[PDB]
Amino acid sequence: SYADMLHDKDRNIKYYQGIRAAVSRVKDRGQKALVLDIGTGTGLLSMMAVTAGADFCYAIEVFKPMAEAAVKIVERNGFSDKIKVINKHSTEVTVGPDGDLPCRANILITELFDTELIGEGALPSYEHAHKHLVQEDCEAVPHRATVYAQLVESRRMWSWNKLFPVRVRTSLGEQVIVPPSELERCPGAPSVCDIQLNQVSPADFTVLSDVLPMFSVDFSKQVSSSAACHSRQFVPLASGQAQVVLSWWDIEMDPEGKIKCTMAPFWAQTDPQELQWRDMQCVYFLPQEEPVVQGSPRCLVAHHDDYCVWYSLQRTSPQVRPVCDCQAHLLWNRPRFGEINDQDRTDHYAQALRTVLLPGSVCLCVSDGSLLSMLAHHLGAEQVFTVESSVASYRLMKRIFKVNHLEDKISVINKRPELLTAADLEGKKVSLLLGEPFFTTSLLPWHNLYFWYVRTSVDQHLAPGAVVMPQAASLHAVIVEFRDLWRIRSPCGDCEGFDVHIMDSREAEPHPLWEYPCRSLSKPQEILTFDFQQPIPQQPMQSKGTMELTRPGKSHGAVLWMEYQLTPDSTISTGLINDCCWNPHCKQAVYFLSRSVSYVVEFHPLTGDITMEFRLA
Ligand SMILES: Nc1ncnc2c1ncn2[C@@H]1O[C@H](CSCCCCNCc2cccc(-c3ccc(Cl)cc3)c2)[C@@H](O)[C@H]1O
Ligand SMILES: [Zn+2]
């Protein structure tokens, strides 16, 4: 997490300018400059405050390992005389004879901000600090933040929050899978969706409002963690369906507002060429979509408690954070909603099924919260068994079956799919085991090989000449140059003249690369192939190999992903779709390196784990 904090020169330079100005304001009134730095991490901002002329710094860090690093970094840079590191939560910190501080500080520095601004406890930390740790009449860096909101319509972003009608073409015309009405009514998951709006095509949404300033936090004055709401009257820039609130904040480092960072996306700033990349923006969903009309004014309401923000449109006439009362939002993350609502993807799976559905086939469907079972039945399966391994998921799938009048056409088995019995299949044999494959708990692409393990575990229940779908799957890699993402894992070593070197097999990281532009240096190479049609070989699959770097640029990482061979005539990619183009529904794995790259990759059968190394050569 704290590798990103150092690579952000714009953040560091602005904190440094704020700290110089805030220490000078205090020294110039003839006063002792006493710094309280809540969330010191490395101590960088405490080291800045001393170079600026602060008399002492009290640097608070709750995470022991970081506290201990901060102690060593302060010593190496020569600041131990003027910086005391305290390993506690700021709310446990006291002023007194047996206290952490001898007296209240008069310069308050923090970096307790996430994408939502208040999600890392800034409101309660600042509250406790003004109450107990800081003088009235005190400098704060940052001085003030402001949260902005922009109302939009976005089929694509609304497809992260709602189940749409799903179409399949049967022999006897086109069929429609409709969503349970309670989904349509749900406010959705009571949590922010944090995205790089800079990578959203301006075609994917229509702006309905100006950028509205919704509220400000003044860090120099007493701050409340109390629930509040802020209403802004606005004039719709156009007519359409109010669906999504795009949000971001800016900070001012000084009382005059001269020193400023903003998280604003490209289209809300004056010059795209002056943009400074961040490791971003918020996407919220209105609890109901509703039409707005050009010229015809409405009131957008920002709500917040001590950690959470949420949005409503005030009724024309005319508060707990609403929660999911439909189940779906607790089982399906935003990407998964988007994935299920991709009609081209459903069409591609439909055509795969028309192929491998021999007359009177007996389908077992394996994949969490999957619509394949409904497609299978609509396309002429004799009988459909499906596995849902949680009660919540069992109940949601039964609910979707019921409202589509298929409650007696599809059997849900509520077990771990590998532990399935002959009686769960009503003594019938499976002619067609099928899946996406998708499982809720899969973090890396190959975790979905759990499908293959299940296929192995249930061999004895498969009819002779049983077809599997996917029939096979392959691990693919490509070496890439990242526009920006390298900074997430690239040691700083020197940070504004301060030495943080003490801060600066390898597990591949999952990342939604549709949000992180990059270009291919190698050609894409198939690394391992998995034959689902057969059991898992109980001996590890290895594969040494070479990838020739054919266009120039810093070889930043190997991007790994799955492809699934559905039928012989049909394949689908969770990685490259044809700057690299990435399937926006799945996370790809990145191996960070640290005229050719060489690899050892090994798949382990007892686990599904894959160990790998990528060395330049
Ligand atoms: N109350 C606490 N007391 C003591 N330690 C405490 C307390 N809370 C927390 N921590 C510690 O503070 C430390 C920090 S937390 C927060 C985790 C990192 C979040 N940045 C990531 C990020 C994303 C997006 C934007 C920005 C950004 C951009 C510009 C500007 Cl100008 C300012 C910020 C930053 C950790 O080391 C915690 O362990
Ligand atoms: Zn819900």
Largest interatomic CA distance in the chain: 91
Residue 325's CB is within 10 A of a number of other CB atoms, namely 11
Q: Is the CB of 1 under 6 A from ligand 1?
A: yes
Amino acid at position 349, single letter: Y
Domain ranges of the chain: 1-143, 144-327, 328-471, 472-617
Q: Tell whether ligand 1 has an atom less than 6 A from the beta carbon of residue 63.
A: yes
Torsion of CA 235, 241, 243, 248, to 10 degrees: -30
Instruction: Establish whether residue 125 lines the binding site of ligand 1, counting it when its CB lies within 6 angstroms of any ligand atom.
Output: yes
Q: Please tell me the distance from the alpha carbon of residue 564 to that of residue 549, in angstroms, as a whole number.
A: 26
Q: Is 95 in the pocket of ligand 1 (CB under 6 A)?
A: no
User: Which residue has a Cα nearest atom 36 of ligand 1?
Assistant: 41
115 Cβ below 6 A of ligand 1: yes
Whose Cα sits closest to atom 37 in ligand 1?
Answer: 39
Contact at 8 Å (CB) between 556 and 482?
yes
Dihedral sign for Cα atoms in the order 604, 607, 608, 612? negative
Q: What are phi and psi of 70, to 5 degrees?
A: -55, -45
Provide the experimental method for this PDB entry.
X-ray
d(CA 227, ligand 2 centre) in Å: 23
Q: Which ligand is nearest to the CA of 129?
A: 1
Adjacent-strand bridge partners of 557? 480, 592
41 lines ligand 1 (CB under 6 A): yes
DSSP string computed for 115-166: TTSSTTSHHHHHHHHHHHTEEEEEEEES-EEEEEEEEEE-HHHHTTTS---E
Residue 344: φ, ψ to 5°: -65, -45
Pocket test for ligand 1, best of 6, 111, 118 (most atoms within 8 A of CB): 111
The residues annotated with a catalytic role in the active site are 111, 120
Pull the structure tokens for residue 222.
Answer: 């007493």
| Residue 111 Cβ contacting ligand 1 at under 6 Å | yes
Beta partners for residue 74, in sequence order:
none
- The fourth-level CATH superfamily of domain 144-327 is Hnrnp arginine n-methyltransferase1 (2.70.160.11)
Ligand 1 midpoint to CA 360 (Å): 59
User: Is 509 in contact with 592 (CB distance < 8 Å)?
Assistant: yes
The alpha carbon of 169 and the centre of ligand 2 are apart by a number of angstroms equal to 28
Distance, CA of 531 to chain centre: 32
* Residue from 498, 492, 485 nearest 15 by CA: 498
Listed residue (139, 133, 134, 112) closest to 123, CA to CA: 112
Bridge partner residues of 309 (DSSP): 304
The minimum-distance atom of ligand 1 relative to the CA of 88 is 4
Q: Which atom of ligand 1 is nearest to the CA of 15?
A: 31
Taking each helix axis from N to C end, the angle separating 44-51 and 9-28, rounded to the nearest 10 degrees, works out to: 40
Cα 120 to ligand 1 centre (Å) = 7
Phi-psi region of 300 (alpha: psi -120 to 50; beta: other; left: phi over 0): beta
500 lines ligand 1 (CB under 6 A): no
Q: What are phi and psi of 350, to 5 degrees?
A: -55, -55
Residues 161 and 190 sit within 8 Å (Cβ to Cβ)? no
State the ligand closest to the CA atom of 179: 2
CA distance 139 to 109: 9
Q: Which atom of ligand 1 is nearest to the CA of 1?
A: 18
Q: Which helix (H) or strand (E) covers residue 495, if one does?
A: strand 494-495
Could you tell me the distance, in angstroms and rounded to a whole number, from the CA of residue 2 to the centre of ligand 1? 9
Contact 304, 312 (CB under 8 A): no
Give 27 Cα–ligand 2 centroid separation in angstroms. 55
**From CA 329, how far away is CA 323, in angstroms rounded?**
9
Task: Specify the DSSP element, H or E, that contains 603.
Answer: strand 597-603
Q: Atom of ligand 1 at shortest distance to CA of 261?
A: 31
Q: What is the Cβ-side half-sphere exposure of residue 581, based on CA atoms within 13 angstroms?
A: 3
CATH number attached to the domain at 472-617: 2.70.160.11
Superfamily of domain 328-471 in the CATH hierarchy: Vaccinia Virus protein VP39 (3.40.50.150)
What is the whole-number distance in angstroms between the Cα of residue 52 and the centre of ligand 1? 22
Q: Does the Cβ of 268 fall within 6 Å of ligand 1?
A: no
C-alpha distances (whole Å) from 76 to each of 43, 71, 578 are 12, 9, 49
- Whether the CB of 503 sits within 6 Å of ligand 1: no
Q: What is the resolution of this structure in A?
A: 2.4
Write the CATH number of the domain with boundaries 1-143.
3.40.50.150
Beta carbons of 253 and 212 less than 8 angstroms apart: no
Domain 144-327 shares a fold with domain 328-471: no
d(CA 249, CA 211): 11
Instruction: Name the nearest CA neighbour of 526 among 485, 567, 565.
Output: 565
How many angstroms from the chain centroid is the CA of residue 31?
Answer: 45
Of the listed ligands, the closest to the CA of 191 is: 2
Give pairs for 449-455: CB < 8 Å, separation 24+.
449/473, 449/530, 449/603, 449/608, 450/608, 451/366, 451/367, 451/532, 452/530, 452/532, 452/536, 453/418, 453/536, 453/608, 454/366, 454/417, 454/418, 455/366, 455/532, 455/535
